[PDB]
Amino acid sequence: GTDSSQGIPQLVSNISACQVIAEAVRTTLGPRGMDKLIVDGRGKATISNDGATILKLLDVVHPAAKTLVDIAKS
Amino acid sequence: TNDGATILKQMQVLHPAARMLVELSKAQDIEAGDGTTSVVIIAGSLLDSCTKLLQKGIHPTIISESFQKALEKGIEILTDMSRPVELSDRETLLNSATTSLNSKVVSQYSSLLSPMSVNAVMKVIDPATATSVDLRDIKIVKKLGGTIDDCELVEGLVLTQKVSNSGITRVEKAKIGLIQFCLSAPKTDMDNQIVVSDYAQMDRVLREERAYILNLVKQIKKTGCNVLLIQKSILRDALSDLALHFLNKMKIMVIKDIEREDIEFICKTIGTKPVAHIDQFTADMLGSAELAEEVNLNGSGKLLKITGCASPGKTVTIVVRGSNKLVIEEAERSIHDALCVIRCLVKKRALIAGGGAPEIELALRLTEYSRTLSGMESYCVRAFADAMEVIPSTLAENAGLNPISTVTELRNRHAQGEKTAGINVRKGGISNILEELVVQPLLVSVSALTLATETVRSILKIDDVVNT
Amino acid sequence: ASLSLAPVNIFKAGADEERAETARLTSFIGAIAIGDLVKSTLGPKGMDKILLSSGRDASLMVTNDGATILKNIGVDNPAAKVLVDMSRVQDDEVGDGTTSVTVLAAELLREAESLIAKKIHPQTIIAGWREATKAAREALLSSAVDHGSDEVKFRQDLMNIAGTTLSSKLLTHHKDHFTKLAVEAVLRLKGSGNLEAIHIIKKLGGSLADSYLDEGFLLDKKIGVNQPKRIENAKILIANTGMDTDKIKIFGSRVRVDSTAKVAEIEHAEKEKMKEKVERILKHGINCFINRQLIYNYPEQLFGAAGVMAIEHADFAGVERLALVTGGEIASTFDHPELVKLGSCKLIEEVMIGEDKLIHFSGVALGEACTIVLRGATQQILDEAERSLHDALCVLAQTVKDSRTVYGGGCSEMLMAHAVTQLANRTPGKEAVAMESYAKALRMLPTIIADNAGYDSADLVAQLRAAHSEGNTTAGLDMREGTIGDMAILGITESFQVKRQVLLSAAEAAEVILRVDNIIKAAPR
Amino acid sequence: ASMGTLAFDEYGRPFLIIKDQDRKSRLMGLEALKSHIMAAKAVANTMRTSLGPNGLDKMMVDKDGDVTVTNDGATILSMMDVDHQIAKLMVELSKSQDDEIGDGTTGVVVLAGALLEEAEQLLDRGIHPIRIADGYEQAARVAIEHLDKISDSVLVDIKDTEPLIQTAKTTLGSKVVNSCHRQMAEIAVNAVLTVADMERRDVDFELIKVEGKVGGRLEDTKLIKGVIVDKDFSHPQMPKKVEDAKIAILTCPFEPPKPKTKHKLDVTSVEDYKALQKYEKEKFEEMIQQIKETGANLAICQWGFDDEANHLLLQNNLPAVRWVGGPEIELIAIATGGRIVPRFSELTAEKLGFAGLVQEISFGTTKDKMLVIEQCKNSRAVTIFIRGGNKMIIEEAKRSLHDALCVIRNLIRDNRVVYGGGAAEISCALAVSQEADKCPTLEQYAMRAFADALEVIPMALSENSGMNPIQTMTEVRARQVKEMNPALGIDCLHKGTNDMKQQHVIETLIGKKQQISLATQMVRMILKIDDIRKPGESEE
Amino acid sequence: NSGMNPIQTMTEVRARQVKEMNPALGIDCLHKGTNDMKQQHVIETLIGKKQQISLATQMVRMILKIDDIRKP
């Protein structure tokens, strides 16, 4: 939390977190999109071209990230 | 301390050469009993000759065989010059013992100790027709304070452990009894739990333990013993308060914490067999008694002196005194060196006057043999003789005297015929020391020469040292 | 490509890869380093070496055999580990030639480095070396001679081989007497190939000449107190019982008492059981009894009252060799006194040598065990002498198994070198160059063998080469004056099987090590 | 795309994007694919040198300090300090090829290396991976069709193994053991045919163990149709040689079993102590009589026995061993046909296996012997004994025999085989060139990329040996144009002829088609992955 | 500087010198066969070696007349 003060800077932080969480899934839209393989602890890296399947295995910690993932899950 | 055996065995440098020199000294002490300082000094001299022999670009293998030839020649010379004695010649034994005591702090305490040493040897081993001497026959009681005059020639047994039976002293005609069962409550080999649910049962517990210990005391007195000795037990209490009280009420001396190693010595000396079971309390424990006195050394040490037995073994004991531990050790090791000298007199009865005379003669003879030789062998034998010349230099030193003059005068006196010329410490000059009774056997100098030659050969063929 | 010059280093901390020539440089430099560390023990003038322990133990040992250095040394180069593995294999095969095979492998690797620097592929080198090894083996078997049928010639060859083994060691002063002693010791087994039966002792002090052979057995276990000290012509029984506070092996058993009277009753019951066991032991008709574990005060007192000696602290090796030499049978249940054979001995005594009490066995019945007395001033020379004696026993056993022998001391080495050189000049291609480098390493082995004496090399090597070209295949270098002459008349002979095994082991080790191209490393800990 | 993103907001305030971004090297996209492909570059170029008979051998020192010199690439790279997931994917590729076939595991890695070799230049030209992957899959189909076209099969069955012997010798030529190729081929085929199922079933490798001891000479490697037992007899005077022995399977110690649950027994009086002593003595008596009732020759104890049991067995003169491992018990029971015995309750002479011959083997002055079992009339287990000058040549022999037996198993699975040594590789390159000449233009770049990828096998074979690669390449290609033959390739052993068939080299076609398909699939997968996360904090 | 033995060389030299005296009974450095410098024409001025010995003796003595160092 850097410049996470009341007002606009915290909104800027949330927007940046949203951009970062989008970047991970930004490239898998469509039927001919690339797939993602990211280390997930014990090396059971999973191949999944579906963006939602990528979403269930992410490491979201920013509140903006969580409050976007919940909408995606719904 | 003075004698080098303990000095070498105490200090340590961790370098392999130092440790093997210490081992050489220990082996020399084992084989003969003295000359450890002489053999290590000889080794050092051979090595200072060796380094100069080595800077001259000489292979360190031909020098080994040259040293072997020098060793065999020196052994031949020493055997030739030595003169045999007789086992019945007490004068020669007294001379050897006195010479042995000279290199110790008790040098002037020799006229009373050399007959003491030879008499102790005669007592503890076969008077004649024997080959080996058991040094374990005689034990030593090292006591602080006192003087050499306070030393004794006791022939009984001394218990250094304190009298746990306080108030009991000087049991006249004491009958020594050794037991191994611990004086405490009975305990099974297996774990037991004394569960008590009634007052009567708990009362019966200690009532029965008291009855059993009283029965034990009664069966102990069945034979009629008056002195009790217990083993050194740490898992179980060797002596308990109840047993001590019951034995003090009816006058039995009690001493605990007795080592199990002395039991074999006691059996060899008198024969009181240890007892582990109460039912085997026979009548063979005891015997005739002569004296049992708790001597005190002006309050500087508590001892239990029990001397005098009927038909004992061939074992005696020595009580060595001295103001500080160092002089006590010096006197003890002087006595031990005298005993080892008598042992060396037992076998290979070939005596030669010492005091640098054998080393002067050996140096001269090896110089002659080197002159007769040729090649690198002659130079190696010359270095050998120059090295072995060190002992008369050290003896001539420690007094400020000239080593060069002493060595050349001794060599000239050997050349004119007087081979037995040595160093006279009392007169502070150079003359024959046969009158001074400075004589040593063959298998002390021979052993030192052989051991030093073997060690220098061992370290001679060495290339590198590596660690693991 | 190589990871040495790469944009990234795909490694953990401390793990690295180096260029192929650098990798072989490191591996073979470690191999040659261990090689010349084991070097300088070849020939009769081999200089000894101290095996020091860098840790707090500081255990100092001296040995002339390089295999002792090999078994106890830190490992840095993987090729050095391969070398110590193959050398240990050779040592377990035969007791001599271990340093020989190690130094041959080290050379083969160093001229392999030189030849690769001379722009030659490793596979070509391997092929040429295989051809040269085949030629050398065929030449060695061509000149191999067996003389086991002739008993006098067999004994003379045993003399020569034991003298050959002892020449490299410091025992050359008594070489002949120790040789006949060891040959008598190995023949005392009546053709038995085992060597653990022959047992040795150590006694500080005394001259090396004082060493001798004892036909019976030497024992160093103390005797009890109450039992009589010396009883002869007795029967010796070996037992595997604990013989100390014998208790019920059931774990769940426990004692629950309400008073000390039952405690004393249980104590008396245990004492009575121990007495019954002692009587059961005594029922066997035995006076000298041998046990492994401790003996407490009550059983030793009972034995003393019974006038029967009990010997404790007899380890597994000691009872093994005692049973081998006397025929005694190990027992664990003493309920059948007559169903276990008792040991038979002629004379038993407790001799006094040095400043210790040693029990000496004489007139052993079976005699299938040799006990050797060795005397030395220091423990270092003692262990060197015993190691040399054990190596002599090993090589004597190897000769006994097969008497095919060859003339060593550089002689058979010149045979192999001549054959390999002849084939190399016979054949074209870089394989000939590789196998000629093989041959020059073969020639340089006895070169340094003789140079360890500070002698000349080229003249003797050329003279022996010319003589064997004339057909003097029995000519070998004489260490006595650093000269040449008939190798057989010097009484120095080497077993053909040992030579063949050393040659094959060196060839295979060089082949397997040379095939390594690059070194890859995991994460060190 | 390094050390995070530099924005610092846009009105002058401090800005935070990702945790630990002060030194985080953020890797997505084309540069991430460059990173992965170049890591695979390093892996492939470091591994590829073990191809062909002239191919050298890599060594590795593991995290435990144990060396490993090896020629078979699967086990060469099986213990690598893989960090990026692409290397691990190649590791599972190698494992899949190895347990699928056994040989050619080097081929997939080198083929993928060259595929990526030209794929990275195609990416540098600005080509998105989808069309590259599609062209590569089309090319793989073309190569598989060529492989099917140039197939040739022979007899493989148990009755005739001379072609099997030639195939095994060819396979082991690449290994250092090629000195006695005929001897190892014969002993390996004897071992595999000692116990085998010919009805397209698996051969019990649990019962065929490749074990040996160091020492002796390489040619002494011989087949032992039986079981190897490491343990030895406990007693010195105990006999060492027993013939026509019967195996007494024992899974209980020679001591009275104890209750599992915690138990307490109250011994209070002298009578109780004596009663417990006599009960224990009679329990030993019952146990020893029960053991002797079966009358078996050899008794194998898993939990061993105590001194009293040892003496009782000595008096009974019944050979027995102690503390034997469970898997060894299973192996000996299967080989001898023995039955499970829980304890003395089910101990009888009718449940005993039979061992034909039992001996103690000595290897000179070692004081460590071993027990060999063979000559079993119904031996269901066969083992091969290998001698060597050191433990690592022993390990190399182990893996060489492993690979040879895997090749034999592949041959038994199907006779559909082809000719290796780059000749089939050159034919596949010709086919891919033809397809490039006869298929739409845009993907022809991927066509010729795949062709140059398949061209690396003769490349590596030639540069391993040392001949000029490209002149031989062109000459063999021209001759293959003159005559269609999967037996015109590199003469690695310098035999002087390019007729590969004349040199008796046979490899399974299934292996090669699986190699090509697996390599294409893995390359296609790696082409479509551009995401790896690293903290890159550069800790001190 | 070359490698021949020192001591057998010494022995042979003084054996020949006691058999006959000549100022040219020395070392055959280049294997001319004989230890006779006259045949090999090994010539040096007497004055040079005279002064060699003299200067060596005097300076060795005057170095022996020094036994003190006081480095600060």
Ligand SMILES: Nc1ncnc2c1ncn2[C@@H]1O[C@H](COP(=O)(O)OP(=O)(O)O)[C@@H](O)[C@H]1O
């Ligand atoms: N009165 C004396 N005059 C001259 N020399 C003596 C006299 N008494 C003893 N020595 C010499 O002192 C030496 C002492 O040797 P040793 O007892 O071995 O020394 P250490 O006891 O230190 O080992 C003897 O070798 C002997 O020659």
Ligand SMILES: Nc1ncnc2c1ncn2[C@@H]1O[C@H](COP(=O)(O)OP(=O)(O)O)[C@@H](O)[C@H]1O
């Ligand atoms: N009298 C001799 N003359 C020449 N060479 C010898 C002689 N005696 C032994 N050798 C050689 O010296 C080598 C040294 O043997 P040793 O050091 O005991 O073990 P290793 O053979 O492993 O080096 C022997 O292999 C032998 O071939």
Ligand SMILES: Nc1ncnc2c1ncn2[C@@H]1O[C@H](COP(=O)(O)OP(=O)(O)O)[C@@H](O)[C@H]1O
């Ligand atoms: N005699 C030979 N000449 C030319 N090439 C060969 C020969 N033997 C095998 N090869 C080739 O070398 C390649 C490597 O085989 P090898 O190293 O034995 O196992 P892997 O195929 O698992 O690497 C094989 O694909 C084969 O085509």
